[PDB]
Amino acid sequence: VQLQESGGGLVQAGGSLRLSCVASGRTFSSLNIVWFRQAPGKERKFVAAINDRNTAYAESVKGRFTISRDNAKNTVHLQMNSLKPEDTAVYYCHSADVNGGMDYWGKGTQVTVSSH
């Protein structure tokens, strides 16, 4: 199936958005969630991951983005602060267990950052 995403939008540079990735099931705490993004004309690239409670960030977003999880609500959040036009992309979340099973994708949600 597919994961559910929300929180995208169009925002002035320097603004913030918070994306959500929501999964169904009873196994959410066992899932590792990864965010990817694709800017127009470019390839899909790693953004951030939460592996149990461990967090990892691409060099381009470290410090500005924070990934977190609320296992009680089956949700991972990506808080994006200090947004730049180069953060404009479709953002996708991906789930899996430790071996690479239980692997699902979200459809993608748009994040657009205008310059001043």
Residue numbers in the entry: 2 to 117
What does the published report state?
To build an atomic model of 2-up+P86, we determined the crystal structure of P86 at 1.60 Å resolution. The asymmetric unit contained two structurally identical monomers (a root mean square deviation for Cα atoms of 0.20 Å); the three CDR regions were visualized well. We fit the P86 crystal structure to the density near the down-RBD in a locally refined map. The map showed two featured regions: a loop-like density between the down-RBD and the NTD of the neighbouring protomer and an elongated density located on the top. We fit the CDR3 and the C-terminal (C-ter.) region into the former and the latter, respectively, and the whole body was adequately accommodated. After manual model modifications, the P86 monomer fit well into the final sharpened map.
Nanobodies are small, stable, customizable, and inexpensive to produce. Herein, we present a panel of nanobodies that can detect the spike proteins of five SARS-CoV-2 variants of concern (VOCs) including Omicron. Here we show via ELISA, lateral flow, kinetic, flow cytometric, microscopy, and Western blotting assays that our nanobodies can quantify the spike variants. P86 potently neutralized the SARS-CoV-2 Omicron variants compared to clinically available therapeutic antibodies.
